[PDB]
């Protein structure tokens, strides 16, 4: 959005004491975003764990599926012989 | 200082906090006038966009009603 | 609501430093109003998109209905021949 | 200035906030007294208006009950 | 509740520049009550409109019932003739 | 100016706000002492009212249970 | 309440200007407690009214019950005669 | 004034507000140090009570599970 | 956790009057932690009481079960004799 | 003061309040710059963590669709 760019340009023109205070404000918003990013990291880790679990359970069910299929084929072949 | 804001906005509430923290007489008056002019221009642009899309939505709604009524004619 | 006009009259009578301060305050409140404008613009944009997609769906349904009606009429005419 | 407030009103918590923030010694006292008197007068007028509206609503309610009773008599 | 009267008399005894600030906060509070009264007035207006529309509907049904009774009585009288 | 607020309260949150804003060294010390004594007495009287109503409620509830037991026995 | 006792001890030792401000703020918190007391006495009065109306209802039902019982006994005695 | 505080507390929120308000230079520094040490000691004691009750809860839960085990093994 | 240690290092470098204010504010934070601790204590005590009452109920039921089992065994033995 | 904070973090809201409170000109500027450097350094590290996690999510997701499609082809 152009509004933020215009505000940045206006404050840069204002600048050209203030620098240190602006940096302190950036520090405050940075620590707020530290908290936000920690929260999102935790949520994403939980999502990763859930996906991991569901994928191994899918693997286990498909391995039973293929084992049963092979057993059925073997029994049919034996009976046909 | 502006580079940090540029970084933080390329990353993605920040604008509101920055402008609130932004919130000698002659220079202050001149800067205030510049900010007011920029903001007024942006508001005028926003209102123009709003009215544009408002007539757009009105036309789309009337088109919907007309087509539905024609469909009911068809039955 | 005549309160705004009365307040304007009282402020103008009081006025005739402070002007710059009140301009700064109205600037801040304007900055606040900008976010309301943004929220409105976003919600109406989603509304516009939904209206558009509904338009195309009804377009397609009407086209299919008309095609079916024409096919039925042609079949009846062919049988009557 | 006041032109911004005029634009805001004709465009129709923003106005509430600006009037809250807007709100030597002798002039200040005189202005405060005038504001307080104007506010009190307008408050009295609003009280009168709401009293009239309440009386009208009560009368309409009683008319409603009376006519419903008449209808039940008719049946 | 007599506590407010006791507070008023105690503050009057205390008083006998501060008066101007007291009046300032007083009209601020009365401005808040102005907003409250505006809201109450609007809600009462909505209630009045609802009362009017329900009265209109009741008038319609009453007229229907009266007319119906009239033609029933007239038909009975004609049959008696 | 106090009489104006008295008229406002008798016309109908106001008390809390006016008391919060209500809150010279010797004068303020004496007035604070007086108001603290007044509030202490008022709070003691309120506590007496609380105990009165509480014992009344307890007695009424006990009578209710005893009389309900009477009713169940009689049936 | 050990924290309260120890804090009181520490404050009294520190004190022995302060007293006036402390008693002013305790005046304010007593005002808050007064508001709390108003709320609780109101709710308790409502409970009292409810209890009274239940008492009245039980009175009426017991009166009807005993009247009916006496009437049934009288009818049985009359039949037995 | 502390007597009023203790009387109010023994009469029944107040403690938290008064302690947040409560919190010669050397005297005040020493008083602050003493208060901080007292608070740290009380926090340690509270943590001790926490571990006591947690051990109690763990023991009760294990006994519960064991007794349910024998209950279901009874048949 | 490491970020906290690094911040502690930086501020120990800076500070090594402000120390007293930092101590005061840490005292306030810990006095809030006191209320947190009290809430945890109360909740865990309630949990312990509930566990104890459940224990008592289960003791009752197990005693009845054992008594019934012994009675049935004795009855069977009497019949067998 | 730092010992109390490190003890309390070893025990495991605290850091949020502490950093909100903590956050002559030359020393102030130097300490501020050091803080900025450290904070932005582990900011960049955390973004690296985010991107690696997103890559992991994409890989796991596509592996999931592949195995589900294999299941569907199995029958």
Residue numbers in the entry:
A (entry chain P), C (entry chain R), E (entry chain T), G (entry chain V), I (entry chain N): 50 to 65, 105 to 169
B (entry chain Q), D (entry chain S), F (entry chain U), H (entry chain M), J (entry chain O): 33 to 44, 52 to 62, 103 to 154
What does the paper say about this structure?
Ten of the 12 monomers from the basket are linked to the turret helices, each of which consists of one long helix extending toward the portal cap and connecting to two smaller helices arranged in a small helical bundle. The two non-contributing portal monomers are presumably disordered or flexible beginning at their turret sequences. In C-capsids, D-capsids, and virions, the turret helices are fully extended, whereas in A- and B-capsids, they are retracted and positioned ~65 Å lower. C-capsid portal baskets are positioned higher at the portal vertex compared to their A- and B-capsid counterparts, which has been attributed to the densely packed genome pushing the portal up against the capsid shell. Only C-capsids ultimately become infectious virions.
Three capsid types have been recognized from the nuclei of herpesvirus-infected cells: empty A-capsids, scaffolding-containing B-capsids, and DNA-filled C-capsids. A unique portal vertex exists at a 12th I5 vertex through which the genome is translocated during assembly. Here, portal proteins assemble into a dodecameric basket-like structure that is thought to seed the assembly of scaffolding proteins, in turn driving the formation of spherical procapsids composed of MCP, SCP, and triplexes.
